Design a protein around this motif. Structure first.
Motif, short mmCIF file in Angstrom:
data_model
loop_
_atom_site.label_atom_id
_atom_site.label_comp_id
_atom_site.label_asym_id
_atom_site.label_seq_id
_atom_site.Cartn_x
_atom_site.Cartn_y
_atom_site.Cartn_z
N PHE A 1 -3.31 5.76 4.96
CA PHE A 1 -3.11 5.29 3.59
C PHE A 1 -3.56 6.33 2.57
CE2 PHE A 1 -3.83 1.12 5.78
CZ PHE A 1 -2.54 0.64 5.65
N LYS B 1 -4.76 2.11 -1.18
CA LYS B 1 -4.79 0.79 -0.57
C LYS B 1 -5.75 -0.12 -1.30
CE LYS B 1 -6.65 -0.11 3.12
NZ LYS B 1 -7.08 -0.27 4.53
N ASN C 1 0.86 -1.19 0.00
CA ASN C 1 0.00 0.00 0.00
C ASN C 1 0.89 1.24 0.00
OD1 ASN C 1 -2.51 -1.41 0.23
ND2 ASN C 1 -2.37 -1.46 2.47
#
Ligand SMILES: O=S(=O)(O)[C@]1(CNC2CCCCC2)C[C@@H](O)[C@@H](O)C1
Length: 658
Positions: free
Chosen positions: A256, A259, A238
Motif C-alpha cells: 500500500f 491506506k 486504498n
C-alpha cells in the motif's frame, strides 16, 4: 484422470457439429469438467460453444450449454423441465478476441461439482463465477439427453445459437477437478495480471491503473484497490503499488502507498443482481485516483491521490469548503469536535489542536499519520467490517481497535466532509511509501479540492519541475512544484466546460512545450499547449478522428523516445467508440515540427471493437516496448459492475502498432 473425450481443430462456421457418438455413452456420474481452447474473433451476438441436449419434440428446455456473447460475456445454461430447474450463470467481459493481429486462444474450464453443488467457470486462468445451488442438476442427468453438439444447441431437432469461431481443443472429464488442478492447465493468454483478487491487498476489485518508467529502468504501477465492489467513493478504497525490474515480465507482490484502517481489508463478493448491486460502503474513509512522477532532484518517486473522509465521495463532498482556514498565507486543517455543530478547531504547527473560539491550545495533537493523540497518548476507535449475511449490506463494529484518525467516522475530531489531495513519497523506488501529507488548498477557503487526474505526473526534461494535472468545474488546475513536492503552486487553464470530468494527461513535445490531452463532454478528446513549462496555457482544440461517448473516458498519453517514420511520436490510449467504453486503441501520432501539430497516422485495435476498454495506463518500457495496463471492461455500464481481474497488462512493440 484422463478425459473421456478429446477432439480438436473444429471449425464453427454457423453449422453445428454432432459429437454424440463420441461422448454420450461415456458421460458418467454427476460431476463433470469441460476444458475448451477456442477462438472467436468474429462472434455472432449470442452463440453456443458446446451443448448437451434432449433434442426431442416437447423437450426444448432440457439442455446444458456453454455460451458467449459478442460483448465478451461467457455463461452457462442448465435446464431440466421435469425437475423444474432453469439455471443461467454468466459474467460480462470474460473473453479475449484478438491480439497483435491474431485470434486469441481462450482457455475455458467449467467445473460441475455434485458433491459441493457448485458450478464454477474459469476463462484464461480467471475464476469468473462460482455458484452454489440448493438443488444440484448434474449436466449428465438432464432428462432425455441424446445429443452432444459443438457450435450450437440442438432443440427439437433444430440448431439454436449458431456459432462463428473455432474449437482448437475440447476435453471432457467425469470428475470435478480441483482449483489446484485447474491452475495446472496450460494457458495461451495475451495478457498478465499485476494486481489480482486474493493478493496482498485483499481487495476483490481494482480500478484506475497507472504506469510509470523510472530512471533505474524499474517500471512502477499504482491502482485503486477497491473493496466495496467497483464503486467510486464513498467506499473503502486504498492505493496499492507494484513494480517490475524486468521490463514488465514479472511484478512484485503489491504494497500500500495510502491506506486507512477504519474498515477491515475484506475480500468480498459484491452482489451483481439488480436489487443489491448499488450497495455501497457508506461509513469508510477512502483514497481514489492516483498519479505518479519521479523527481530528478531528490530522486524520490512521488504519488498523489484524492483523499475522502468517512462516507464522502464526489457526489456529497462539500463543494464550498476547502477544509482549511487561511491565516496570513498559512493554511490550517479545520476540525470539528464531537458534540459541536461547527468547526471550532484547527491543526497548527507541531500538530497542536487549537481552539479557535478561545485562542488557546488544547491537550490534543495530531501526528503525521493524521491520528489523534491526547496528552501524547494514542486514542483509538473500533474498526468496522461489512457483510451481506442479512440479505442487505451491513456495516458493523468488529471488536478490533485501530488508531483514531481525523478522516474516520468514529473520530473525536473530524475534518470537513469534502475532498482533498494528498501526496506520499518513496525513497526506494516503490519498495515502501511514507505517511501521506495533505496538499494545501489552491482555490481559496470556499472551494473543495480539485480532482487529481489519474495516471502520470510530468517531470520536465530540462529542469527539476514537476507537474500534476487536476480538474475542477470550469478549468484544468495544474499543480506545479520546483522543489521535490515540498511546495506547490497552481496554474489554471480555463476549459469550455462546466462540471466535466476533465481527466488530463500530459506529454512534453519538445523542451518546455507541453501538450495536455483531456476528456470532455463533446465526444472528442481535447488538447491545450503550454510553451513555458506549464506557467501558461493555450486555448482548447479538439482531435478529429477519435470518438468517445458523451460522458467520455480517461485518455493516457506518452511521448515515445524513438522516431517513427523519421518523425517524433506521441501515443494515445483510449476507447474509440461513440457508444460505450469499448474498442480500445493505441493511436500513434507524428509531430509536424513546423507548428507542433500532430498527424494521427496509425490506429491499433487492442481487441475487438465490441470488447470492453475503459481507463488505461501506458508507458514506454526501457527496452522500447510499450506496456499497457487497462480496464478490460465497460466501466460505465451498469451491467458490468463488480468484476474481478479485469485490469490486465499487455506488452506491445511499435511494429505491432504500425
Ligand atoms: O521521459 S520521462 O517523462 O521521464 C518517462 C520515461 N522515459 C523513458 C525514456 C527511455 C525509455 C523508457 C522511457 C516517460 C513517461 O511516460 C514516464 O514513463 C517517465
Amino acid at each position: 484422470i484422463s478425459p473421456i473425450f478429446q477432439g480438436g481443430s473444429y471449425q464453427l462456421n454457423n453449422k453445428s457439429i454432432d459429437i454424440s457418438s463420441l461422448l454420450l455413452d461415456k458421460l458418467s456420474g454427476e460431476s463433470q469438467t469441460v476444458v475448451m481452447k477456442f477462438k472467436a474473433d468474429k462472434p455472432n451476438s449470442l452463440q453456443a460453444l458446446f451443448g448437451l441436449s434432449n433434442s426431442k419434440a416437447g423437450f426444448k428446455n432440457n439442455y446444458f450449454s456453454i455460451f458467449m456473447r459478442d460483448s465478451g460475456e461467457i455463461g452457462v445454461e442448465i435446464r431440466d423441465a421435469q425437475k423444474g430447474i432453469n439455471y443461467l450463470f454468466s459474467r460480462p467481459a470474460s473473453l479475449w478476441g484478438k491480439h497483435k493481429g491474431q485470434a486469441v486462444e481462450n482457455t475455458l474450464v467449467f467445473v460441475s461439482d455434485s458433491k459441493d453443488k457448485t458450478y464454477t467457470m474459469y476463462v484464461n486462468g480467471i475464476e469468473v463465477f462460482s455458484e452454489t445451488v440448493d438443488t444440484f442438476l448434474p449436466i449428465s442427468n438432464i432428462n432425455g439427453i441424446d445429443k452432444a453438439t459443438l457450435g450450437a444447441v440442438n432443440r427439437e431437432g433444430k440448431e439454436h445459437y449458431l456459432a462463428k469461431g473455432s474449437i482448437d481443443e475440447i476435453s471432457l472429464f467425469n470428475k470435478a477437478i480441483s482449483d489446484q488442478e485447474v491452475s495446472t492447465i496450460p494457458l495461451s493468454n495475451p495478457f498478465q495480471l499485476i494486481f489480482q483478487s486474493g493478493d496482498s491487498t485483499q481487495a476483490n476489485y481494482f480500478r484506475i491503473p497507472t504506469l510509470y518508467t523510472l530512471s533505474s529502468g524499474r517500471v512502477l504501477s499504482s491502482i485503486d484497490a477497491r473493496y466495496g465492489g467497483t464503486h467510486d467513493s464513498k467506499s473503502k478504497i486504498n492505493i496499492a503499488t507494484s513494480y517490475s525490474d524486468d521490463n514488465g515480465k514479472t511484478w512484485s507482490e503489491p504494497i500500500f502507498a495510502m491506506k486507512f484502517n477504519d474498515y477491515e481489508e475484506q475480500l468480498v463478493y459484491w452482489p451483481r443482481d439488480n436489487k443489491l448491486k448499488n450497495s455501497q460502503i457508506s461509513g469508510s474513509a477512502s483514497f481514489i485516483d492516483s498519479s505518479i512522477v519521479e523527481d530528478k532532484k531528490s530522486g524520490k518517486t512521488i504519488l498523489l491521490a484524492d483523499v475522502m473522509p468517512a462516507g464522502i465521495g464526489n457526489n456529497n463532498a462539500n463543494k464550498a469548503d476547502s477544509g482549511f482556514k487561511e491565516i496570513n498565507g498559512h493554511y490550517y486543517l479545520k476540525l470539528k469536535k464531537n458534540g459541536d455543530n461547527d468547526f471550532r478547531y484547527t491543526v497548527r504547527e507541531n500538530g497542536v489542536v487549537y481552539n479557535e473560539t478561545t485562542n488557546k491550545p488544547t491537550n490534543y495533537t495530531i501526528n503525521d499519520k493524521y491520528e489523534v493523540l491526547e496528552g501524547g497518548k494514542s486514542l483509538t476507535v473500533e474498526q468496522y467490517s461489512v457483510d451481506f449475511d442479512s440479505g442487505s449490506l451491513r456495516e458493523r463494529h468488529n471488536g478490533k481497535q485501530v488508531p483514531m484518525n481525523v478522516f474516520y467516522k468514529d473520530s473525536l475530531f473530524k475534518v470537513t466532509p469534502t475532498n482533498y489531495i494528498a501526496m506520499t513519497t518513496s525513497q526506494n523506488r516503490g519498495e515502501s511509501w511514507e505517511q501521506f501529507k495533505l496538499l494545501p488548498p489552491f482555490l481559496g477557503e470556499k472551494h473543495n479540492g480539485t480532482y487529481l487526474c489519474p495516471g502520470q505526473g510530468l517531470a520536465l526534461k530540462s529542469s527539476n519541475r514537476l507537474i500534476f494535472a487536476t480538474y475542477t468545474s470550469g478549468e484544468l488546475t495544474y499543480l506545479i512544484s520546483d522543489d521535490s513536492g515540498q511546495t506547490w503552486k497552481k496554474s489554471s487553464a480555463s476549459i469550455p466546460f462546466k462540471n466535466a470530468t476533465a481527466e488530463a494527461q500530459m506529454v512534453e513535445l519538445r523542451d518546455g512545450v507541453i501538450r495536455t490531452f483531456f476528456r470532455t463532454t463533446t465526444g472528442k478528446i481535447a488538447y491545450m499547449t503550454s510553451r513555458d513549462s506549464g506557467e501558461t496555457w493555450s486555448k482548447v482544440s479538439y482531435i478529429d478522428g477519435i470518438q468517445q461517448t458523451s460522458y467520455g473516458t480517461q485518455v493516457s498519453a506518452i511521448k515515445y523516445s524513438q522516431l517513427i517514420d523519421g518523425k517524433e511520436a506521441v501515443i494515445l490510449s483510449t476507447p474509440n467508440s461513440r457508444s460505450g467504453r469499448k474498442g480500445g486503441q493505441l493511436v500513434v501520432g507524428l509531430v509536424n515540427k513546423e507548428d507542433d501539430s500532430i498527424d494521427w497516422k496509425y490506429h491499433y485495435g487492442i481487441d475487438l471493437p465490441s470488447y470492453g476498454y475503459a481507463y488505461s495506463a501506458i508507458t514506454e518500457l526501457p527496452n522500447h516496448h510499450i506496456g499497457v495496463l487497462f480496464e478490460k471492461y465497460d466501466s460505465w455500464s451498469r451491467n458490468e459492475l463488480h468484476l474481478s481481474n479485469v485490469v490486465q497488462y499487455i506488452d506491445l512493440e511499435i511494429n505491432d502498432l504500425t
